[PDB]
Structures are given as C-alpha cells and as structure tokens.
Amino acid sequence: GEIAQAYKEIAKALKEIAWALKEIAQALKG
Amino acid sequence: GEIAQAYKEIAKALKEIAWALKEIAQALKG
Amino acid sequence: GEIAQAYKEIAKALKEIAWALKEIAQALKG
Amino acid sequence: GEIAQAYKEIAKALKEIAWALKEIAQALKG
Amino acid sequence: GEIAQAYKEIAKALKEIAWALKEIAQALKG
Amino acid sequence: GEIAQAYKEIAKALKEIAWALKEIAQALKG
Amino acid sequence: GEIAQAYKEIAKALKEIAWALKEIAQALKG
Amino acid sequence: GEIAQAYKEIAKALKEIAWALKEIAQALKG
C-alpha cells in the first residue's frame, strides 16, 4: 500500500541520516 | 493520495538532513 | 486537507533543520 | 481540528530546533 | 482528546530538544 | 488507550534526548 | 496491539539515541 | 501487517542513528 511504502521511504531516509553520522565519525577519527 | 504524498515530502526532507550532515563531515575532513 | 497540510508543514520544518545543519557545515569550513 | 493543530505544534517545535541549530552555527562562526 | 494531548506532549518534548541545542550554542560561545 | 500511551512513551524518549543534549552542553562548558 | 508495540519499539530506539548522546557527552568530558 | 512492519523499519533506522552516534562518541574518545 502507498502509506506503508511512504513509511518505508521515511525509514530509508533515517538510514541515510545514520550513514551521514557514520561519515561524521570517520571525519573526527582523521 | 495527499497523505502518502505528504509522507514522501517528509522522507525527502529527512534525506536533505542526511545531505546536510554529509556537508558537516566534509567540513571536518577539511 | 488540513492533516496533509499539517504534514507538509512538518516537512518544511525538517527542511529548515537541514538548512541550519548546512549553516553549521559552513561555520566549520571557516 | 485538534489533531491537525497538534501536528502544526510539532512543526513549530521542529522550526525551533532549526533556530537552535542556527544559534550553534553562529557560535562556531564566533 | 488523549491522542491530540499525546501529540502536544511530543511537541513539548521537541521544544525541550530545541532549548538543549540553544544551551549547546551558549556553551560553544563561552 | 494503548496508542496514546505509546505516543506518551515517544514524548518521554524525546525528553531523554533533550536531557542528553544538556549533558553535551555541560561537557563543552567544562 | 501490533501498532502500539511498533510505536513502543520507536520509543526504545529514541532512548538508544539519548544514551548514545550521553556517550558523546562523556567523550567530550574526557 | 504492512503498517506495523513499516513502523518497525523506522525503529530499526532510529537504532542505526544511535549506533552512528556511538561511533561519533568513540571517535571523540580517540
């Protein structure tokens, strides 16, 4: 359904935020 | 539908937050 | 509808958060 | 309606988070 | 209603996050 | 009701995020 | 119910974010 | 159900944000 699919897109966007925060960790380590 | 479309706009906004966090990572790497 | 319009306002507010995080990146670059 | 109004209060709170992040940017620029 | 009241509590909690981020800005300024 | 109670638990968790951000502010002030 | 249980899992995940932010505060204090 | 499953994916994504924040803490401790 389109609502569950839109919530899945929100989950994917939150995973992109997590990946960006991992990139911040890597930048701090350097 | 307008509700699923509004949730998709929330997902797009969350992706923009991820992009901004990546810009923070790049600024720290410099 | 008023609910979809309120979700659109939440998306706009999340975009403002993304813009503020971009401003943080610019501040770190300086 | 009370639900749409409550979602609008969530949007206003998210905008306050954006303003606070801008204050962080300004503190880093100083 | 109890659902709108619970969303209002979420908005108040997001405002507390904004205030804490303002406290971070003040800490960086010092 | 169980849904309003679950939303209240989300608000409490968001308040814990605010408290944690205040601990970050205090760590920067030291 | 499965929806209230899923919202409870979201609250638990937000508490994990708060704990991680407390870990950041501890790292800054050191 | 697909909606509860989508909310569980949002919780998992929020947990990934917590893990990423822990990686930030570890980078600061180094």
Author numbering:
A (entry chain B), B (entry chain A), C (entry chain B), D (entry chain A), E (entry chain B), F (entry chain A), ...: 1 to 30
Please share text taken word for word from the publication where this structure appeared.
We targeted two properties of αHBs: oligomeric state, which directly affects the internal diameter of the channel; and the identities of channel-facing residues, which fine tune this dimension and introduce different chemistries.
Despite the requirements for aliphatic residues at a and d, up to 40% of these can be changed to other side chains without compromising barrel integrity. We introduced mutations at one or two of these sites to generate four groups of αHB: Group I had entirely hydrophobic interiors, but with different sizes and shapes of channel; Groups II and III had polar uncharged or polar charged residues, respectively, at specific points along the channel; and Group IV had aromatic residues installed in their channels. Finally, seven Group IV designs incorporated single Tyr at a or d sites, or Trp residues at a sites. Finally, one third of the designs were crystallized and yielded 12 X-ray crystal structures, all of which were open αHBs with fully accessible channels. Conversely, the FAs generate signal through interactions with the more-hydrophobic and aromatic-containing channels (Group I and IV).
